Symmetry: D2
Subunit: 388 residues, 4 copies
């Protein structure tokens, strides 16, 4: 009946989302720039919990140390005036031309060292503002051609970079953790660590893996045609879902950054179901772009719809799981047996169990239907509010 967000729902937005001016690779900006202070005030009025930023969203590139203290001071006063928080920050290592072949894995060694110094400068600012997560999206780490990048040497350089950042925050005593954001392509023809799985595997080779997790994005995994709730489950299973970027995507094409709930609606339902039933307690961060067709009233409408659709889906997924008819269908489909160990009795007792092989009636087991279609139609009816 009521889908009004409050700061306790932990909804957050990047400054670059509502602040996107509408420039795309075929067209000029359609909106004027927004002052960060205005975005903070506007988002607070809509019920958001907080904002996030890249260094260059908040402090224009090439700013003097004095212009920098001014930009931060103004920002901090808007945070104090509104009660908004800053739970995550990140570095822009993709817009300036010096990063055209990457930041941490640029072929030029001087660019790699510059990228690390630009990053470290912003981790200190993030800690000052109270961020608990520092995201890294290596949007330019990759290649358009095969010979341009030796990927084993580039992974050595990427490991070296994250290892030095871990050393830095530990030597400084900071309580901040890192989250790597995978994306398969765009703007490079192929990007390194293209999916949540490749990022998870990479983290296990860092020197201090407990400091690093993932920041998956809905549309990124869908650009590889993957099931985003399945990848989030794997990240939760590994203990590494540190943050999450929510938006919508219609399939395998350029990154559309639609508002959350747009794109694949059923996948959004199953995602909310999983985050709420696993008790994910981090921010619900929207990394989206209001389409360039819109004026500023459409920007705020689009941001409000992100939060509204999360809260509708949350109510429908909770109704689904609480429905005794669904709980019976889950048992009929043997979800309860999936959660039981296959062989708590141990290897030797499995080997000696004739009911597991010699005397197993495979034709009788094969004839049992799984009853998944009736379960899925109950899930559809709940999503559409069609229960009777």
């Amino acid at each position: 009946m009521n889908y009004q967000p409050t700061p306790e729902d932990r909804f957050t937005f990047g400054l670059w989302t509502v602040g996107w001016q509408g420039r795309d690779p075929f067209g000029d900006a359609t909106r004027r720039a927004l002052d960060p202070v205005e975005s903070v005030r506007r988002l607070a009025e809509l019920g958001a919990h907080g904002v996030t930023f890249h260094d260059d969203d908040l402090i224009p590139f090439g700013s003097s140390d004095s212009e920098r203290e001014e930009h931060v001071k103004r920002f901090r006063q808007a945070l104090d005036d509104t009660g908004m928080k800053v739970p995550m920050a990140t570095t822009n290592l993709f817009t300036h031309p010096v990063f055209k072949d990457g930041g941490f894995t640029a072929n030029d060694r001087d660019v790699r060292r510059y990228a690390l110094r630009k990053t470290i400068r912003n981790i200190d600012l993030a800690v000052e503002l109270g961020a608990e997560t520092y995201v890294a999206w290596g949007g330019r780490e990759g290649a358009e051609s095969g010979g341009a990048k030796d990927v084993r040497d580039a992974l050595d350089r990427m490991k070296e970079a994250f290892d030095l950042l871990g050393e830095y925050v530990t030597s400084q005593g900071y309580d901040i953790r890192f989250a790597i954001e995978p994306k398969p392509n765009e703007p490079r023809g192929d990007i390194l660590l293209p999916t949540v799985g490749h990022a998870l595997a990479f983290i296990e080779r860092l020197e201090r893996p407990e400091l690093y997790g993932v920041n998956p994005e809905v549309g990124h995994e869908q650009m590889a045609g993957l099931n985003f709730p399945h990848g989030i489950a794997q990240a939760l299973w590994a203990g590494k879902l540190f943050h999450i970027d929510l938006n919508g995507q219609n399939g395998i094409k350029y990154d559309q950054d639609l508002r959350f709930g747009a794109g694949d609606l059923r996948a959004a339902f199953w995602l909310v179901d999983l985050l709420e039933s696993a008790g994910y307690s981090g921010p619900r961060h929207f990394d989206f772009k209001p389409p360039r067709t819109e004026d500023f009233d459409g920007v705020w409408a689009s941001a409000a719809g992100c939060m509204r659709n999360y809260l509708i889906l949350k109510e429908r997924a909770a109704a689904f799981r609480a429905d005794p008819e669904v709980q019976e269908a889950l048992r009929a489909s043997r979800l309860d047996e999936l959660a039981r160990p296959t062989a708590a009795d141990g290897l030797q007792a499995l080997l000696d169990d004739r009911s597991a092989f010699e005397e197993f009636d495979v034709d009788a087991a094969a004839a049992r239907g799984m009853a998944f279609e009736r379960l899925d139609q109950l899930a559809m009816d709940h999503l559409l509010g069609a229960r009777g």
Copy 2:
């Protein structure tokens, strides 16, 4: 000039590849079944090194222990007569109806225990035949709908299954290692561990991770639109490329299993370049299907073309890397600098280096071109044999 394979090139084929009868989801078989003994003899004549099998390719399902010893004896005599080896084996946990919801992660616990016993029985046979790698492709582990599979519980069951198989081979003293083969979809709507990255990350949570690697397949990663040479580089970087399945795929669609070299030809070039320059020494295994348009002469022609195209690409990639003009272009594109540590001087010296930030001339660095297009055209000229 000569592209004739010999058993030293380590080319291997599954019995199910040349033995595929042509049944697809819309049509009946177009070829008669082949006897395994005939395939071994035919493949040996073409210059192959060895063959691989699923348990049910070699021993028809529901065979008595006596019919089983007969099937194996005949097979072993063809191996002895030809000099062919058996470097890898695997289990069929996908064809029989009992596996319709999976083997290791089936919701029904009795099916999960049966899948493990069927697997263990075939590991013993594989060891008897001298296989060094045991592959697992969980083709039915997955779902068509969101509520049918809790993925955290399914990963617990998958970990449990691989952990028990590791216990078994260690308690038996066997020198065989496991390779997990990822695939993103087909025949399930989404398959668990869909890419090389998700498999690599999963392995790091097994109790004895050193026993497990990956068996990536060209067409599988391309069904997610990913760069297969990049994923192989990541697997090599992690020390986990235990085996590899070679074939061709035209993009994101059903798994075509074309012969190797078909599909994305430039990706095949960069793959061969990487395997030969990293010194991969395992089998070059072809997991492909001769199209159902072909008769048996076209089957053998298709198998021969797999090996021929590998050896042409091997010669062109070696000519590329040996060309002094290419070696100069690699330096011009700073591939030599990519291989140097970013900061061997350490964190504190990076922080105190003004040339890395305060005094870094970003506009001069940004203006340097990377010269990647001339390098890539040298690579194209070498691939096409157009050097002058």
Copy 3:
């Protein structure tokens, strides 16, 4: 409140849909075959209007003329007993091995002539049973390799085949029309006439184009990543939507044939909105497969869900369009102006209109927002039943 289908909703199902035994390219059948008579009775009980068939679903291949009259007689008695109709029929030119390189565009001329005779025999039966539409899905017309098929010669053969079928029905005086069903791939690597657009363009070169339309399928166009409601609008605009196949598909991958409403739910909403507002009056035909996880109770559950989801979406799209708040938002987004001619005043008056160029204020026009995000959130709220 009520989503119970009746025969007036015109829901139809192919015999091969609920009758699919579950054989996929990696696994054996999981269900027994269904007798056509049982499917007709079962579907009638669920509220369906009618059934469709391929020749070989109803009469097993290689049946004697006498076994054939028997199969038809039994079928006709089930139709009479239930009131079910047969609005469409089609030919199987894809399952038997003789069709491995196609029916109408097979390279072998004798196969092409056989395909036409098999087709003509079944058009006569379809007319006898009262079908008004004859569908053609050229599932084997295509190629896996470039040199195997000269596509201009194959389109000449396809045109020749459809032209002879048009001559046949006109010389016989039959009132039946043809509908070509496009698909981009599977089971051939690329299929000719891969999308609704390529089929529409081809029809305009037939000798009697008024006899031919399209039979688009939801999942087929989504296998090319296309917007299915947009392609249906183009077909309606051309006067050629003769029939439609409804199902669900999760993106670009093998053809999943999920029940309608599954897959891309928002696209299903916009499709129903368009069919009901354009007054499409043909059958709502479901071409889907109950997943092979299911037993026969899950088959009927899946078929019922096809109809249920159509009727829920129909009610939500009608509520959307009738909502005065939506009608105001449509005007705010200038959908009313889109429907007005750009230049009913004619070319010369446009050329002399200074307000159209010399004096057009482009900056003022560019600043107007289109208000599409608020319209789309109204559409989301209606779909989810969240209006307040």
Copy 4:
């Protein structure tokens, strides 16, 4: 041995290709702007035949009639100095913010009239410069959401626009033809007329269809996963290939605009084979972007590689078709029979031919292999220059 282009090879380039400054949706320009006069001179030195332009590439938007005559005069003097021609021109209806919801199908009627006047002004200039083809790429005609665009009304507006342009060139007596360029998405979420087929079908509903053809682009059709040589064959079959845009694309993702020959190399081979064997005589136009990693030496290297790869592939496809071994394999695969009419004897003689049905031996026909794998390996050997 020699792959040096000359103006007789008819290679052409858009000003916006080599002139692309490197701005992408995540980053700033990496190259300075090029003066059109410099590009003409540079391209002439490389062996190009001519250049193409959008109105706004040549005359900056908002130019006075006097600044406009100056820009044209300078350009014309570079054309005269170099011998370069201008065979095609087009309109930019996508960059300025006023076109954010489209040009010809914008919801706002005043924008639609402005788009037509901007177009007509540039057709006159194109004719003055001697262009024979006028291209239209409706990059902003489309939508991100379902309710924003009624597609039947938008196709009425698109037809109205092209019909008025046809009236204009006929009333002026101009000898120029139009070519519509389809693209499936980007920058709109879905673009109207998304593929060559949808454009071909649309043209048949214009009032003077003989004035309109298509301008297909390699990467555009591959963004829908379609076979570009098959779509070009259909366009040639319909008599509508008026122009062609050549580039490379790695699969279904954002439009990469790689140089021709990059991306799918085998598809480039089959495309060149078809254009040269069908005797396409229009321009070979490159619509590509040198990657933003490159400096100006890499721009010219990338442009040269476009032409080089066309000429290598042309030589390999001509060697393929001329090889007597290939000509025998084409007969073995019955390509000669594909080109023969199925039933030149007519419908009645087909119906009375018992050898076409009653007495057709389907099992003997089904057993004949098509020999396509050996043909395809001959095509691979020719492409790689590996014939022996």
